[PDB]
Amino acid sequence: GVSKTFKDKCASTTAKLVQSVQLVNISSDVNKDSKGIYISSSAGKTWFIPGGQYYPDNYLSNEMRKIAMAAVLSNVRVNLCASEAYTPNHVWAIELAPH
Amino acid sequence: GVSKTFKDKCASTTAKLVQSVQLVNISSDVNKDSKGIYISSSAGKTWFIPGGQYYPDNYLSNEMRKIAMAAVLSNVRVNLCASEAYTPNHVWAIELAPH
Amino acid sequence: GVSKTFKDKCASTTAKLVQSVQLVNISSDVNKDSKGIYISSSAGKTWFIPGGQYYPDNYLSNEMRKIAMAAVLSNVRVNLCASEAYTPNHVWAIELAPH
Amino acid sequence: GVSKTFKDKCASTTAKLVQSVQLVNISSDVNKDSKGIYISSSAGKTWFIPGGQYYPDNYLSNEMRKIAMAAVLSNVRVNLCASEAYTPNHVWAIELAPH
Amino acid sequence: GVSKTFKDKCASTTAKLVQSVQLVNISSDVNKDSKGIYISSSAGKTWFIPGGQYYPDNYLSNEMRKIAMAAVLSNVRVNLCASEAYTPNHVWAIELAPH
Numbered sequence: 001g002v003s004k005t006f007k008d009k010c011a012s013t014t015a016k017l018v019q020s021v022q023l024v025n026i027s028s029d030v031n032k033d034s035k036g037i038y039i040s041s042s043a044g045k046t047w048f049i050p051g052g053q054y055y056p057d058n059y060l061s062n063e064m065r066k067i068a069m070a071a072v073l074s075n076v077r078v079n080l081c082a083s084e085a086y087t088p089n090h091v092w093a094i095e096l097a098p099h
Numbered sequence: 100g101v102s103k104t105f106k107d108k109c110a111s112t113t114a115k116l117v118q119s120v121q122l123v124n125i126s127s128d129v130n131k132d133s134k135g136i137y138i139s140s141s142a143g144k145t146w147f148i149p150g151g152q153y154y155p156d157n158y159l160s161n162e163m164r165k166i167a168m169a170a171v172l173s174n175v176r177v178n179l180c181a182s183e184a185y186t187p188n189h190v191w192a193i194e195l196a197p198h
Numbered sequence: 199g200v201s202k203t204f205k206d207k208c209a210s211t212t213a214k215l216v217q218s219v220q221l222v223n224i225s226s227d228v229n230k231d232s233k234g235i236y237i238s239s240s241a242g243k244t245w246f247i248p249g250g251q252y253y254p255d256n257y258l259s260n261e262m263r264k265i266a267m268a269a270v271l272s273n274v275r276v277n278l279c280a281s282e283a284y285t286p287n288h289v290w291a292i293e294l295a296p297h
Numbered sequence: 298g299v300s301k302t303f304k305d306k307c308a309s310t311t312a313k314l315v316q317s318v319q320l321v322n323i324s325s326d327v328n329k330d331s332k333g334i335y336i337s338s339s340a341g342k343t344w345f346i347p348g349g350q351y352y353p354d355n356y357l358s359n360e361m362r363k364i365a366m367a368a369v370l371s372n373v374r375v376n377l378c379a380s381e382a383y384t385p386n387h388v389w390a391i392e393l394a395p396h
Numbered sequence: 397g398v399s400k401t402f403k404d405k406c407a408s409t410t411a412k413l414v415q416s417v418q419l420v421n422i423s424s425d426v427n428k429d430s431k432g433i434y435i436s437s438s439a440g441k442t443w444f445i446p447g448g449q450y451y452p453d454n455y456l457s458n459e460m461r462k463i464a465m466a467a468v469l470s471n472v473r474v475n476l477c478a479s480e481a482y483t484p485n486h487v488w489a490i491e492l493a494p495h
């Protein structure tokens with residue numbers, strides 16, 4: 001499920017809660033115009049996970065990637081807090097939700 | 100169970116021992132006002148895992164996150180040493196306790 | 199499968215999409231003339247995964263390696279975006295594609 | 298079992314060889330007075346794994362932690378080279394020894 | 397199996413190809429005179445994996461460690477490119493070779 005804190009923190013922003021998503025792809029891309037981490041759901045929706053060059057976004061972005069990678073590789077659900085102001089939508093928070 | 104060392108180290112602080120917690124969620128959040136790592140128990144309690152910018156808190160905080168992530172992903176218990184001076188409570192030490 | 203985003207981002211470059219590859223080897227080599235990460239398919243084709251010294255190529259190249267390592271160790275498929283301008287061909291994007 | 302090299306290197310120091318230990322706990326602690334990584338065996342012995350701020354102790358200490366973490370999480374044995382000059386004893390070398 | 401590229405790159409150096417080795421130990425040692433990462437085969441042979449302080453040897457040596465660690469923990473074979481000019485012999489390249 002989704003933690004109350006996760007839902008409440010997402011509700012304090014312009015981003016949308018996406019609940020119990022099954023990710024089936026994660027990619028890393030070093031191409032000039034498309035650099036970044038993308039994740040895709042079984043339905044084919046794609047999100048972008050922004051990177052962080054400085055503390056604390058550096059280690060926090062790294063944990064977002066580890067959560068997404070584990071979700072794809074172990075086939076376990078996540079909750080996303082995602083901004084629809086971009087295409088693909090940007091992940092601003094992610095929660096591992098295996099049960 | 101809880102190592103005697105873990106219990107004794109927690110007793111030397113203002114933080115409370117939480118024994119045999121089953122974590123079911125871990126999240127990473129880069130939103131401006133809620134930046135951080137959160138973990139949630141099957142009962143729905145949430146804790147915050149502080150970051151560390153400098154040695155040795157940088158590598159120690161990283162190991163706390165690896166313990167929490169493994170606990171969620173593998174569904175294994177932890178012991179927490181948690182400060183109630185914050186909401187959510189802050190984790191100041193964590194022990195992986197699979198058996 | 200291949201995410202539409204992965205296919206479309208690869209089509210915007212001179213690199214070719216390689217779909218549902220089964221990687222059976224990954225190597226790391228510190229020899230003077232051959233330094234780098236190589237990955238090999240069950241058919242015996244080899245690709246090179248370039249490194250990155252600076253942000254953001256440093257963390258992105260690290261994620262490309264984690265995807266390739268998981269693909270080999272867990273025997274799960276990937277999609278590659280690979281440049282044929284080099285021998286072995288260079289991976290410019292990789293997508294973990296378990297199902 | 299224990300590699301001959303591991304045994305011989307430990308014998309060249311003041312530290313004691315501990316063979317085929319089953320680790321059942323690992324913790325990370327950022328409390329002011331008890332900062333560090335601790336591991337505990339099924340028999341109830343506890344060790345401290347020192348950190349390293351500079352090359353090469355930084356990456357070597359990180360590998361010691363990965364070995365201990367995997368030993369706990371996977372329930373597989375290690376060999377330790379531990380100094381009794383401190384309580385808890387300090388780990389100066391660790392060997393993953395699954396079989 | 398051994399990738400043709402892995403074999404050919406090793407043949408361009410003074411190092412020897414060691415094929416389908418089963419590693420049963422990996423150790424990290426911070427002792428003054430024996431600092432380093434060692435791996436040992438089921439036959440009892442030991443190799444040393446050199447570290448790297450600077451780009452690109454830093455990330456490449458880290459990937460060699462991850463390959464060796466996975467080989468030990470998951471009991472899967474590797475290929476080594478190893479120099480006999482040292483005792484223990486130095487690993488200059490390693491290939492994960494599960495099947």
Ligand SMILES: CC(=O)N[C@H]1[C@H](O[C@H]2[C@@H](O)[C@@H](CO)O[C@@H](O[C@H]3[C@H](O)[C@@H](O)[C@@H](O)O[C@@H]3CO)[C@@H]2O)O[C@H](CO)[C@@H](O[C@@H]2O[C@H](CO)[C@H](O)[C@H](O[C@]3(C(=O)O)C[C@H](O)[C@@H](NC(C)=O)[C@H]([C@H](O)[C@H](O)CO)O3)[C@H]2O)[C@@H]1O
Nearest residue numbers: 012013014015050083085091092093128129130131132133
């Ligand atoms: C109205 C309006 O547009 N309000 C905006 C606000 O506009 C101000 C600016 O345009 C400045 C330029 O200086 O002018 C101000 O007016 C000034 C005038 O220029 C001065 O010269 C002088 O006369 O004084 C006046 C008054 O000060 C305008 O007031 O600008 C702010 C800052 O961008 C906007 O704040 C955002 O508001 C939205 C909802 O309205 C959200 O609260 C957003 O926060 C979040 C989000 O939820 O989207 C939080 C979220 O955690 C965060 N995500 C991450 C990953 O950190 C995102 C993210 O940072 C952004 O969405 C990315 O763009 O933002 C507020 O930041 C305000 O809406």
Ligand SMILES: CC(=O)N[C@H]1[C@H](O[C@@H]2[C@@H](O)[C@H](O)O[C@H](CO)[C@@H]2O)O[C@H](CO)[C@@H](O[C@@H]2O[C@H](CO)[C@H](O)[C@H](O[C@]3(C(=O)O)C[C@H](O)[C@@H](NC(C)=O)[C@H]([C@H](O)[C@H](O)CO)O3)[C@H]2O)[C@@H]1O
Nearest residue numbers: 228229230231232408409410411446479481486487488489
């Ligand atoms: C006749 C002779 O000694 N030739 C060696 C050469 O001598 C130089 C003189 O000709 C010059 O006038 O005076 C200089 C002194 O100021 C020199 O003495 O020196 C070169 C560079 O040292 C030697 O090159 C080495 O040659 C080896 C085989 O002949 C071998 O090719 C070495 O390359 C490798 C290797 O295969 O062993 C390439 C490996 O990828 C590399 N491994 C790593 C991890 O990078 C190793 C490694 O760097 C060395 O083994 C470490 O000692 O080197 C090559 O560099 C030349 O033989």
